[PDB]
Design a protein around this nucleic acid. Structure first.
Ligand SMILES: [Mn+2]
Ligand SMILES: [Mn+2]
Ligand SMILES: [Mn+2]
Ligand SMILES: [Mn+2]
Ligand SMILES: [Mn+2]
Ligand SMILES: [Mn+2]
Ligand code: NA
Ligand code: NA
Ligand code: NA
Ligand code: NA
Ligand code: NA
Ligand code: NA
Ligand code: NA
Length: 333
DNA sequence: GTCGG
DNA sequence: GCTGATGCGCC
DNA sequence: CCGACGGCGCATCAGC
């Protein structure tokens, strides 16, 4: 059903090879960009020349597209698929906590399959152990209806610790997706701003309560402002158990909420595009601030921002609503 | 790998 | 302890 | 070996 679906799958697959196997993070991003603009292109691509007009598609991808349009495949990708070392490395990176470095190391030590991973628990750190343990569950997408139940648990229990926390479920959920990979919760509290931490355990207290009602079930990593863990909906009595889910919680300075929500709403590729455009307009954006770059490449004072749209306005973009910050594709008949 | 120099 | 590099993660 | 490319939190290491 997807317009230019073959091409866009081909680019995503090369991208992943580059990140996981080549550890070539810049080529990964070039292939992701190429895939993103091709998938948002509303016409069927017929040659490499055409694709080459799109920003981020250059001679080599045009050559591949030309090849893919002739044969319906890419010999470069056939070779990679036959390579059992690449394949196992690629696979191992899908476990949370195993990245391209650990995957390569595991694979040359004879750990090539899940079965092999579950045999060598003792080599895994705590993150990796938890990612192994929930590997199948984490592959499942969360239906928006379960996101609503998880939301109702998180808001209720946040309120119970302190009425002046505000929690906002961002990510794909806030962009309106019908399913989400995980749940990302943006949290503020007026004791925490860019200038002061008036209370010390602001994030912890929330996490503690979420463990106490048995909603958060495991921890991957945790600091003063970002928690990363596992969570799970409580089931109907006797009914089947719900799969475990990833949950991310980020506490942001109350007075930098808009930059924070912009960041945490994504998509990841919108953020990258938006922040790249800001750079070429002479601004630098992160989850806290938008700052102008000095003539010498150095960021100055933060600019005032009273809404998400103020940030767009600064870099001369039409405000795009959350739903329009997702990636999209087109269809053929 | 692509683009701005 | 601090700073800076590497690895892995978030959007 | 042209160099930038989005920006940063948490975990852990190295060197001081
Ligand atoms: Mn579709
Ligand atoms: Mn489009
Ligand atoms: Mn998410
Ligand atoms: Mn997440
Ligand atoms: Mn028809
Ligand atoms: Mn994501
Ligand atoms: Na097609
Ligand atoms: Na181009
Ligand atoms: Na991974
Ligand atoms: Na920890
Ligand atoms: Na489970
Ligand atoms: Na631009
Ligand atoms: Na205002």
């Amino acid at each position: 059903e997807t317009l230019n679906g073959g091409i866009t799958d081909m680019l995503t697959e090369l991208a992943n090879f580059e990140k996981n196997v080549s550890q070539a993070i810049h080529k990964y991003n070039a292939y992701r960009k190429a895939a993103s603009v091709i998938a948002k292109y509303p016409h069927k691509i017929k040659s490499g020349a055409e694709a080459k007009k799109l920003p981020g598609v250059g001679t080599k991808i045009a050559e591949k597209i030309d090849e893919f349009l002739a044969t319906g495949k890419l010999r470069k990708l056939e070779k990679i698929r036959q390579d059992d070392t690449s394949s196992s490395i690629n696979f191992l990176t899908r476990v949370s906590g195993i990245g391209p470095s650990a995957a390569r190391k595991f694979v040359d030590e004879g750990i090539k399959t899940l079965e092999d991973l579950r045999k060598n628990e003792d080599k895994l750190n705590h993150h990796q152990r938890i990612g192994l343990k929930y590997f199948g569950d984490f592959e499942k997408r969360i239906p928006r209806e379960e996101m609503l139940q998880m939301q109702d648990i998180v808001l209720n229990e946040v309120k119970k610790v302190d009425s002046e926390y505000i929690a906002t479920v961002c990510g794909s959920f806030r962009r309106g997706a019908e399913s989400s990979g995980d749940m990302d919760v943006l949290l503020t509290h007026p004791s925490f701003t860019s200038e002061s931490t008036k209370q010390p355990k602001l994030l912890h207290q929330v996490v503690e309560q979420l463990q106490k009602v048995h909603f958060i079930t495991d921890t991957l990593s945790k600091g003063e402002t970002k928690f990363m863990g596992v969570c799970q909906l409580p089931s109907k009595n006797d009914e089947k158990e719900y799969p475990h889910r990833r949950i991310d919680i980020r506490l942001i300075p109350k007075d930098q909420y808009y930059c924070g929500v912009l960041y945490f709403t994504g998509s990841d590729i919108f953020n990258k595009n938006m922040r790249a455009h800001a750079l070429e307009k002479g601004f630098t954006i992160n989850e806290y601030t938008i700052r102008p770059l000095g003539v010498t490449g150095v960021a100055g004072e933060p600019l005032p921002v009273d809404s998400e749209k103020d940030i767009f306005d600064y870099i001369q973009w039409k405000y795009r609503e959350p739903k329009d910050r997702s990636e999209h594709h087109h269809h053929h008949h």
